[PDB]
């Protein structure tokens, strides 16, 4: 073997996390009792802590969680091998950037892929973000994503947000400053890793197709299972709550108050 991070930049970012830790909010997560998903769209989950019921924004929590995991396992990440025997299933960066109508010319998409591609040795070494070129080295339109970092055992992120990941890696990351660049990449990985927003679908609407129904039901189930078996156990075991997250944790009920209305027969 495991690589020791000699780097001054990673240590400054780890200290910055240490300085933002809210002790009381961290204790709430450390001793959480998971209740369930409230909203798969807005990404709200309900947890019990002692005598209270909390409404949590897990979009915000997974963001800091994956950011923290990224900071700890930096340069020692496992890989999610994204390639199969099916060459047609490959992930082409140029193809992903085509989702952005504002990148209205091949050159603007090529600009983004060029920066990412020039930094492929470090993206692979430090982040396990492996990019490969199938044709000639200068063919940006044939630049492919072969591996992603494996942040949490039992977790494989949805790749629906891959277009945003590449677009933000190419436009938001300050590649010029070591610390800002490194922080930026960890933030991009954390953003991609957050479970997707699942919009609400009306199961009573006869106007909506039969295949769209069982598909919403499957997405609804996949998240509930993810949160309950993978995410919340990890959150409960290692999550350090930053103070900026107090807005994302809301007390909704308390047992003393409930037990004044709900009573034994």
């Amino acid at each position: 073997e495991r690589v020791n991070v000699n780097l001054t930049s990673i240590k400054k970012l780890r200290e910055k996390v240490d300085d933002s830790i809210h002790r009381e909010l961290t204790d709430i997560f450390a001793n959480l009792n998971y209740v369930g998903v409230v909203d798969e769209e807005r990404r709200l989950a309900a947890i019990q802590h002692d005598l209270k019921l909390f409404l949590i924004d897990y979009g915000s929590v997974c963001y800091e969680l994956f950011y923290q995991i990224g900071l700890t396992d930096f340069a020692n990440f496992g890989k999610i091998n994204l390639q199969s025997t099916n060459v047609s299933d490959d992930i082409v960066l140029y193809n992903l950037l085509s989702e952005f109508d504002e990148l209205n010319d091949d050159a603007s998409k090529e600009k983004i892929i060029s920066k990412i591609w020039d930094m492929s040795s470090m993206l692979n070494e430090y982040y396990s973000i492996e990019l490969v070129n199938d044709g000639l080295d200068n063919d940006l339109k044939s630049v492919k994503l072969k591996s992603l970092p494996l942040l949490l055992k039992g977790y494989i992120p949805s790749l629906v947000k891959l277009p945003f990941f590449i677009y933000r890696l190419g436009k938001e990351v300050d590649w010029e400053d070591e610390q800002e660049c490194l922080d930026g990449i960890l933030r991009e990985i954390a953003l991609l890793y957050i479970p997707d927003m699942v919009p609400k679908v009306d199961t009573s609407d006869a106007s909506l197709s039969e295949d769209e129904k069982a598909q919403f039901i499957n997405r609804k189930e996949h998240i509930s299972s993810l949160l309950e078996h993978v995410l919340f156990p990890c959150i409960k075991r290692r999550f350090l709550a930053p103070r900026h997250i107090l807005k994302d944790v809301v007390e909704i009920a308390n047992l003393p108050d409930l037990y004044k209305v709900f009573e034994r027969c």
């Binding site: 930049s9 040795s121 400053d177 490194l182």
Partner: peptide, 7 residues
């Protein structure tokens, strides 16, 4: 320590 990738 600074990163070889940054010069």
């Amino acid at each position: 320590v600074r990163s070889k990738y940054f010069k």
